[PDB]
């Protein structure tokens, strides 16, 4: 429940007058009345002053201005009649979907007045569907009953009706009230239904229930039950009304969050949905160098952010100047918010047609600021990636690292993360090769030197960054890097070096805490 | 009667509730999608068909040394006849 | 890492699964919905909007039509499908 | 039979991919029960060949492998009898 958060801030961050402040302070009273409205709107709670809401089934037995206003706003834009018509149309469509097998000749809705969907005094028939045969009129009983009793009565035209009710705390007995309504409509003075064997349905909109205790046609009671269940599950107008009621009562369920990418969903990020594995943990940079005497050099370094797309083999590095992070008179939360805002602005700089459909963030706490900064652009899903990829190896590169150190200006220059696998190898294979290269670089220096350029005559392309290699050279380099990574894992764990399953090895490389 | 118990009824089950099924034709192409309509001659009309197949660069370097890739295309609404269709299988 | 094998449907299904691309007496086979005449399944909010438009007997305006057309065109373009320029400029 | 639904698809812009890789896209004007697609002002692109635009074409239903309809095709109202 949104405690004092139904509106933006109830106009509290403003300079309104005293009357507006009093209205805002009295707004929670309306919500409190609405929440406990069924217990208070009962005709046995107040005196008999039955008043029905205009063009609606809300029969407010009393005069509560707060609850009356809340109910009127809940049913805004002529919701009751539209909901009744939508329910009738949904029932007719559900019937006509397989009406031929159920011995139905022609289904058509009768000419019912708009005031005949809210006036309980006078009723009518909703569906007038022919059967093309002598449909034995079964005894009018509750649909909840499992007894198969049919009196000796047959006819051709069978009718079906639907009613809308807003039951109170005591008026929630949908079955009994519906049976009584059907019985009264059978001998009604003015509700002249065409077929005496015309069933009637009821909807307990207030209590989210539905029932029908009319003449269930042979073989149609399961059909009516299934139609009612499907409607109550996903009735469009009813769903809209429920959403409006939830909004009015300052109630909103905690929406499910994006799942984490485990060792089984590791390769799921290579689909057509663009994913930018944002990992800017190394953004913070400083000298932290022990000077000879007196103090230590407290010189911040020019930071940067990491944005790479293994789903497309891209690499875009936005460098954060140390001047921006020094002397701004703020804490680290402001810096994190600024970083998230910069990421959102760089996403906005990218075209909407090229907007990353998913935004995998390595930083756990950076998802909420990312969603807040770019809530106007919700086409990107902030999915979790628990296994942190070694994307910080760019900061240790001869070219990328030196640039990041000296990039005093915010540059959105792009780069190719894959050396040549973008147009040579598979996208998943390219991501695996990039992961292996980054792991080798993070493992050590000399081992990374052997892995990257085993031959002094073999180096990266002049227009590229990562060392270009063919299939055989890449295989040899990856074998050496895997051996080095196994040695590092054995040293860190004090266990056998090559004793991990292929899935386990992949999870360890991805960064899972195995 | 016999329309929901034949081998075609298996294809019917593949689209029984607009379920997703993949059909492999004679041209080594796999079209995956939800079948909207069928017929007696296996004329399957589906919507949003993803066609995945094997593609080759066809000697892009000049020595015929290349690897086949998974070429993937999207179609809004397709109507594949039962002549070129070889097999079909529903998604588990 | 499974390529598309020729004359085989199991490889494409495995790649789609790895990529994440996947009374008379009877039971009712009823599944109703509200899909627009163009075939697109209208959202519940969009379905309610269409139902309210039908009830009120009034449709979208000129600006609403333009916004809908732009959104539909953008969605279609996205559903249809800068690395080379960044590699050449580097 | 799905041939009756394709016979009622006249004056509609659709494509047909043949068994030899030739895809012909155009406005279909006539279709019999044997899928004899007679279209006007179409363009056919063969396999590893240049596309050619013709004012009239008559593609047979035997060599036609697959079809392609746009998102403005009312398949929910044309597949009924």
């Amino acid at each position: 429940w949104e405690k004092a958060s139904g509106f933006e801030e109830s106009m509290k961050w403003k300079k309104l007058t005293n009357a507006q402040r009093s209205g805002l302070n009295q707004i929670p009273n309306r919500r409190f009345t609405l929440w406990w409205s069924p217990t208070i709107n009962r005709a046995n709670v107040y005196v008999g002053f039955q008043v029905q809401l205009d063009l609606t089934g809300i029969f407010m037995h009393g005069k509560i201005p707060t609850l009356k206003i809340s109910l009127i706003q809940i049913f805004r834009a002529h919701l009751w009649q539209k909901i009744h018509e939508s329910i009738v149309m949904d029932l007719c469509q559900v019937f006509d979907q397989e009406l031929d097998a159920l011995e139905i000749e022609t289904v058509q809705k009768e000419t019912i007045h708009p005031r005949k969907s809210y006036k309980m005094n006078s009723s009518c028939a909703d569906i007038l569907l022919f059967a093309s045969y002598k449909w034995n009129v079964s005894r009018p009983s509750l649909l909840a009953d499992s007894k198969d009793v049919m009196d000796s009565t047959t006819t051709q035209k069978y009718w079906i009706d639907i009613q809308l009710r807003w039951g109170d705390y005591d008026s929630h007995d949908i079955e009994r009230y519906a049976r009584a309504k059907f019985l009264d409509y059978t001998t009604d003075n003015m509700s002249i239904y065409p077929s005496p064997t015309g069933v009637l349905i009821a909807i307990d909109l207030a209590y989210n229930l539905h029932s029908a205790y009319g003449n269930w046609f042979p073989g149609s009671k399961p059909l009516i039950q299934q139609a009612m269940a499907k409607i109550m599950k996903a009735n469009p107008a009813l769903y809209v009304l429920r959403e409006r009621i939830r909004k009015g009562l300052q109630l909103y369920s905690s929406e499910p969050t994006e799942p984490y990418l485990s060792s089984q969903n590791y390769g799921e990020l290579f689909s057509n949905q663009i994913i930018w594995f944002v990992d800017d943990t190394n953004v913070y940079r400083v000298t932290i160098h022990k000077t000879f005497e007196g103090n230590l050099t407290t010189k911040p370094i020019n930071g940067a952010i990491f944005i790479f797309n293994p789903r497309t083999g891209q690499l875009f590095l936005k460098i954060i100047h140390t001047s921006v992070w020094a002397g701004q008179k703020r804490l680290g939360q402001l810096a994190k918010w600024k970083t998230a805002e910069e990421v959102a602005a760089l996403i906005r700089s990218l075209p909407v047609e090229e907007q990353p459909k998913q935004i995998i963030v390595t930083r756990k706490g950076m998802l909420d600021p990312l969603e807040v900064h770019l809530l106007d652009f919700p086409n990107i899903v902030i999915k979790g990636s628990e296994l942190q990829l070694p994307f910080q190896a760019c900061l240790k590169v001869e070219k990328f690292g030196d640039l990041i150190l000296k990039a005093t200006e915010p540059q959105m220059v792009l780069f190719n993360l894959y050396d040549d696998w973008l147009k040579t190898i598979s996208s998943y294979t390219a991501f695996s090769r990039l992961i292996l290269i980054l792991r080798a670089l993070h493992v050590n220096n000399d081992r990374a030197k052997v892995i990257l350029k085993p031959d002094k005559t073999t180096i990266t392309e002049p227009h590229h960054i990562w060392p270009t290699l063919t299939d055989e050279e890449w295989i040899k380099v990856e074998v050496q890097l895997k051996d080095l990574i196994l040695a590092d894992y054995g040293k860190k764990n004090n266990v056998n070096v090559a004793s991990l399953t292929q899935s386990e090895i992949r999870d360890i490389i991805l960064g899972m805490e195995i | 009667e016999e329309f929901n118990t034949g081998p075609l009824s298996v294809l019917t089950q593949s689209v029984k509730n607009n379920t997703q099924v993949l059909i492999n034709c004679r041209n080594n192409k796999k079209l995956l999608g939800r079948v909207k309509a069928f017929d007696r001659h296996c004329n399957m009309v589906l919507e949003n068909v993803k066609e995945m197949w094997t593609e080759v660069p066809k000697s892009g370097k000049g020595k015929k040394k290349s690897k086949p890739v998974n070429k993937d295309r999207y179609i809004s609404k397709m109507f594949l006849r039962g002549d070129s269709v070889i097999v079909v299988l529903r998604n588990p | 890492e499974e390529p598309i094998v020729n004359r085989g449907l199991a490889a494409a299904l495995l790649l789609c699964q790895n990529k994440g691309l996947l009374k008379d007496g009877y039971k009712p086979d009823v599944k109703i919905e509200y899909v627009d005449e163009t075939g697109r399944k209208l959202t519940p909010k969009e379905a309610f909007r269409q139902l309210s438009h039908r009830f009120h007997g009034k449709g979208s305006g000129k600006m609403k039509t333009e916004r809908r057309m732009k959104k539909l065109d953008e969605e279609a373009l996205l559903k249809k499908m800068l690395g080379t320029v960044a590699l050449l400029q580097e | 039979k799905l041939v009756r639904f394709l016979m009622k698809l006249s004056h509609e812009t659709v494509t047909i991919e043949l068994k030899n890789g030739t895809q012909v896209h155009g406005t279909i004007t006539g279709v019999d029960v044997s899928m004899n697609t007679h279209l006007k002002a179409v363009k056919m692109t063969l396999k590893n060949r240049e596309p050619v635009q013709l004012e009239t074409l008559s593609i047979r239903g035997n060599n036609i492998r697959y079809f392609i309809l746009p998102d403005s095709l009312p398949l929910d109202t044309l597949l009924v009898d």
Partner: peptide, 26 residues
């Protein structure tokens, strides 16, 4: 014959701005 399907446009009956009579038409 496998599985085929089709849906009729559910055109909801006009309720407001009818500019006609009281009872809903057929």
């Amino acid at each position: 014959a496998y599985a085929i399907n089709v849906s009729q446009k559910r055109k909801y009956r006009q309720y407001m701005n009818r500019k006609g009579g009281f009872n809903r038409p057929l």
